[PDB]
Amino acid sequence: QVQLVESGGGVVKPGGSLRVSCVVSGFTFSSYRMHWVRQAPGKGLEWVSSITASSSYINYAESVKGRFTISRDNAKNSLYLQMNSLRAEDTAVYYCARDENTGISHYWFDPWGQGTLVTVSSASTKGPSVFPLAPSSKSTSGGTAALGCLVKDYFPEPVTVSWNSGALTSGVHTFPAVLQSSGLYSLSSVVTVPSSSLGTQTYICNVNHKPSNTKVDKKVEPKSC
Amino acid sequence: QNITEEFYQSTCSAVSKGYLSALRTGWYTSVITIELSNIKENKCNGTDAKVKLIKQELDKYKNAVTELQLLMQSFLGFLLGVGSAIASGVAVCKVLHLEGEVNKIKSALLSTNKAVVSLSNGVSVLTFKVLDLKNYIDKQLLPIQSCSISNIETVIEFQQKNNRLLEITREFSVNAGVTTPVSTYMLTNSELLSLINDMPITNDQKKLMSNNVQIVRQQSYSIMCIIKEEVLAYVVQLPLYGVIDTPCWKLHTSPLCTTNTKEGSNICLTRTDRGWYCDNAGSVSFFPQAETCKVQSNRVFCDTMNSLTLPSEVNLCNVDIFNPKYDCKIMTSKTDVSSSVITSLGAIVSCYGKTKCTASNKNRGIIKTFSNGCDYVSNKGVDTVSVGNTLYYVNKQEGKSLYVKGEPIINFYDPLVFPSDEFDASISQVNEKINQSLAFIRKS
Amino acid sequence: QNITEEFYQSTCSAVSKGYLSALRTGWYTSVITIELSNIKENKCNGTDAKVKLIKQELDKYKNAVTELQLLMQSFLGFLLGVGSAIASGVAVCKVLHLEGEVNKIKSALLSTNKAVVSLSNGVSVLTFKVLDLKNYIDKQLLPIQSCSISNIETVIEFQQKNNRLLEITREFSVNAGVTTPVSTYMLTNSELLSLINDMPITNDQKKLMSNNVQIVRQQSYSIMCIIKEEVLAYVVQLPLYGVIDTPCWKLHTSPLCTTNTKEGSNICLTRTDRGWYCDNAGSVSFFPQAETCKVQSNRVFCDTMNSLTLPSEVNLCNVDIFNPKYDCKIMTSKTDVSSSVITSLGAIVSCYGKTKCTASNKNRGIIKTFSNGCDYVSNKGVDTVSVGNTLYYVNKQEGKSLYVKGEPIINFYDPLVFPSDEFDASISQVNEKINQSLAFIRKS
Incomplete structure (x- = not known):
């Protein structure tokens, strides 16, 4: 059964850094291109980044260009997203998804992970x-x-x-x-x-x-x- | 950092890995048009010098048009299968012969040079206009009656504007209307790049195709399609690379034999599954005729029409040839002859009999002498290998090599009941034949 | 009304019929001459701009002449047999090197551009003059000597008149004096038509050749022959189609195997006699290498040098493979791999193992899924078939196809005593081996 499991999410002050991870199983990892997709609380979906099977081509959205860095390790079946200079509007759930395609016009995301939440807030931890x-x-x-x-x-x-x-x-x-x-x-x-x-x-x-x-x-x- | 090699002594084979895939899985068709003229032989007359040249050029143009009009009228490679290469472009032209298709294309290109036109069958094709001889001839070569030319640069301009059509006509004439390598007369680099840019594909595929235009040319077709009214049309069939950037590796094999000193009494063995292997959506594509895969640095361009679909377990044959999951393919013989195989980062030497086998480099000369059997040498400090009366140059590409020691498998067989001739056998088949032969040996 | 097809499920093969023959049975040789000049280095120590261009164009001409002078200085395809392709033209040139044969040709062409000359050995050949550089150089370029050019169009005219010779020299240089596809530089289309019009053949043959000049060019030769005195000569060897308009039919075969669940234990079978079949005179010509036959609409051009002569009884193998009149040739194996064969009006799909096999069209997508075994699909509502990781396009020719049902013949064999590694066997030979093996097992 194909499984994608994300981890590494947490709270981080504005301007900080974080690193999310996604470990896959059930299929040949090094045959597919992978993506990151995020969704803000109460908002819609948004594609973040992609990476081909051997890291030869990489793409980013215009809203995160120059700040995020995608990578993968084919021997461990894991891909990473390094986030830097985090802003308030970077608060969302991050999914890893596998690319499906027909070769010419159709390109979609058939399998999705479960998501990991990242919160960017300037507030300081306080007791109730x-x-x-x-x-x-x-x-x-x-x-x-x-x-x-x-x-x-x-x-x-x-x-x-x-x-x-x-x-x-x-x-x-x-x-x-x-x-x-x-x-x-x-x-x-x-x-x-x-x-x-x-x-x-x-x-x-x-x-x-x-x-x-x-x-x-x-x-x-x-x-x- | 990219590509490494490993040599296995037990089977006398080597594997090179670190390559990246670009597999042609489909086709894309486009229509190229040339706006043409219908000049009648209605010139007044002339006995000048600059008019005679113009008349010769017009005669060439008309002869080319007539010629175009006359043109159109109405191991293991044996397991592959048979396809038809230009079926899709031929279907596009078959559709293009209908009633109102040419008029539709004409009406969609008068104001621009590119356009997407939906044909009667519902498929939308990309059309492109590359040359306009009609405009030039009509508005600059018939000044109302061309009986006297006042400049010499008009002759030069006209003969410069005519070369493209003559060179296309020649190409189609010597090929019977189908030219496999598409040249720069049929499509220039600017036109090919724009055509790639207009395809409905991802930006990764466009980056792959834009940086390897020569390969795209080498894997394309051009089909003479139709010439009616005042339009010349032909179809260009471009490759579609549906799978890109997957790991690929190459397999090299050489015969493995025993080293008895008697003339005969020697048995041989060889793996027959040479070629390229690439990962393809949970399985492997195997190309036996490795001559049909183009290589650019560490990118391999292979055509899926010449491949077999194999399970991912096929890779187990490299690490263990006696594994139960997959049955590896071999051939057997009794003719032991010396030879050499040049790999990505070295050379395999199978040296048998009384032959002399050595390796050398330019500065120091001979630096190794091979004995009987199968051996491997890296290209770090070796320039050439000589086997008998032949000399080879090794590839001087950068990478890391590894030597894996093991007992050759030909020593595990008993020559008495060894199946001598097997062109298309496997490990299990040879084992089952040996078991047969050995069981029949019963007394009383 | 022309092309029909039939698929036989018992043997997993299809036959296409409705084609017409044009078989090349002989050769026709002709001599092409070009008249040269004897220009010697002139002094004309000028400094004008046009004089320099004229000198460059003369240097090119002389270098071409020198280079030309230097050029002449003192399954089942393994049963075919080897011939010599250009023996007749080489014999003609060997004759032309005799004492007075160039003088005879030169003196018989001064008044006309075409003539029939009788050689010393009694054979009469067509001699045709295509270019006259001697007249343009001796007169109108060295008037009795234009050492100060007063017109620029002289340079352009001389450059135009010189391109033919340079192109011919290039073509002969990159081919060692023998160019298989005859280019329009060696023979223009008008000259080729005029030459076809003078052959002593019937009007039907002339109509067949005049409408297919692109095939005639593809099946011709050009041989650099001699350059002496002020004559350049080369021989053109044209095909002769002695048999025309007879019925022809193509055969397609695919492997036939059993469908046991266990990975091994499966036996296969294949007909090895695929190719083109044409009946000329009370018998059948068979061409195993179907790549050696050109097809124009429903006309097939084949060369008898690559054929075998077979009895008319061979056609019985399609109707009944177990007939006694003729013994059909097969191949046996033990490796079952899925593949596809694209036929004239459809596709044959042999789908074995765990592969996924389908057929689709553009409007509705997949419209069929194949099961294990050999099957056939027509091109009436199918655009593509996908076998494993490969995609094929079917031909869109118009015609009728028929499906013939029957039990596959591989089910009639006992796998225990079935021969496997038989590359060049037949029905009777397999039956004999089976009978011997079955008779041996009677021990008591």
Whole structure:
């Protein structure tokens, strides 16, 4: 089965450098031309660079010319993309794809990789800011009362929230993070529980932050008004 | 840094690698037109000197037109197969003989010199106009009645503008309307480059073709197509290189024999799969008649019509000839004669009998003497090898060579039950024959 | 209404018929002469610009004359036999070196440009004068001597009158005095037609030759013969077509093999008698090397020097290969490789192993996929066939094709006792070996 697996993506400040990789298996690597294609979050596709089976011809897009460098190693079945002087608009998922062609008019990309994300942000890594959001009379009664915690001002995206160490899974809804003009994220989670069960059920919001090892937990209980 | 060689002592063969592919997998056809004149023999008269030359030139032009009008009327190479080279261009001309095709091409080229015209069958061909004799003749050679010429440079201009048509007519006349190597009279370098630039291909293919124009010429055709009304048309059939920049290697083989001192009683063996091998989309293309592959530096131009499709496992024969995955092809004999094979970076010497075999260089002279058997010498410090009464010059191309030692395989056979004659056998067939012969030997 | 084809599935071969014959059975020789001048170094120590050009053009003429003077100084193709192509023209020139033969020719052509001269051996040949440089140089260039040229058109006229001799000298120089394709410098089209008109042949033969002058040129010779006194002479050896307008038919063959799944254990078979077949007088002429026959529309030009004489019973091999009247020739092997043969109106596909075989047209793409075995496809709605990594174009000639069904003959053989490495065998010879092998195995 033909497989292309990309790796090496990560966060990097503007003007920095990075190197992505793609390792193939299941076919004769040195018989084909290979490509890099990128897609910005919420945007369309864009061809980046190509390299023939023996590195004799190379092409670049006009937006990355002079800054990126494509290469391959036929003995290891891997090709690389060296990115330099990275800009803000270089934030995207990068795919490796194999060339298919009919010899004259048709040229397409039949097999695609899975993608590797690259983020170019001037912000600096910071720990999350966790606060509780106790239920209130206005937001109670009806059928059930809802209560949650708030995470604020955290740069790296992968923030995970678990309530009872994974023992609460019904009525828990998580919202997508918001990108502020300052470059920091902030996401709030809300939980729905019976109004008559208020106080009898323990609510704790665990915020685990791998890039800052900030594993904090905060109780959400009603506090008068 | 590019190309290396390896010599295998067990089989007396060598492999050169480091080359890059350019394989012709298709054809591209174009139409070339020449706008022509229908001058009648209606000149008034003349007894001048500069008018007689003009009349001779006109006679040449008319004779060429009449001639053009008269022209059109109505080992292992034996496993290849038979194709037809110019079928596509001939089909294009067969279409071009229909009713309104010539008028369509005329109407599409009056204002420009290049155009893409869609024919009645739906295929869109590229048309190009290279010469306009009608314009010159009509607007500068019939000043209303040419009975007196006042300048001599007009004669020179007219005879300069006429040479292209006479040279095309001669070429078509000595070839019966089909010239394989396309010359600069049929297409100039500027025209060929523009034609390459207009093809719907990638920029890599265009870069490959623009830097190797001589090869493109050597692999092209030109077919006399039609001359009617005031248009001369012929078709040019260009190669299409669908596969480019893949690894390719060459195989050299020489006979391998035993070295008994008696006149007979010696058995020989030779690998028969010489030629070029190139990677092609998960398999290998093998070209046995290696004489039909052109080489430019480390780029090989091979025509797929003269190839066989083989599995990628064929390469195992170089590293191990007794592997079970693939059955290598050999031939057997009893005639042991000395000879030499010149490889990319050296020479294989098979020296047998009473022959004298040596290697030398210009500064020091002889620097090696070969004994009986198969041997290899690199070209680092060797200029020539001499075998018997023959002398060879080795290629002086740069690269690295490697010597791989091993016991020759002809020593593993028993001469008593050795199959003496096998032109198109393999390892398994020889083994199975030896097994037969040896089984029948049973007493009582 | 002319070309039809039939494919036989039993033997994996196709026959094309509907062609017409033009067989070259003899030779006709003619003598071409050019009259030279005896210009000796003139003094004329001028300094004018035109005088220098005239001197250069005279130096070219003299160098050409000296060079001309120096020129003369004291399957189944292995069964054909060797002849000598230019024996007759060489005999004519050997005659022309005798004492008074040049004088006889010179004195018989002064009044006219064409004549029939009887040689000392009794043979009468056509002698034809094509160029007269003696008259233009002795008169009008050295008037009785133009040592100060007053006109520029004299230089141009002399340059025009001199090109023929220089071109002839070049052609003879790069060919050691024998040019196979006769160029229009040696014989213009008008001169060739006038020469054909004077041969003592029938009007049908003259019509056949007049409409195919491009083939006549391709099948002719020119031999540098002698230059003595003020005459240049060379012989032109033309083809004679003694047999015309008889039926002719072509044969195409492809290997036939079994389709076992195991890589080995498969036996193959092929008819080796592919080529052109024409019946002239109560028998059949066979040309194994089909490359030696030119085709113009439905007219085939073949040379009998490359043919074998066969009985009319050979045609029975196409209808029934096991007939007793004639023994058909085959070839046996054990290597099954896929390939294609492009026929007159279609293609034969032998697709074996794991290869992918298809046929397609431009509008709809693939329209057929082939299975293991030998098959045939017509060119009625097919443009290309692809076998493995190779692509072929089919001919687009118009005609009808017929498919004949039958069991392949390779299934009737027992693989255990089947001979394999038989290059030049036949049906009866294979049967005899099979019978002997089968009779040996009766031990008790």
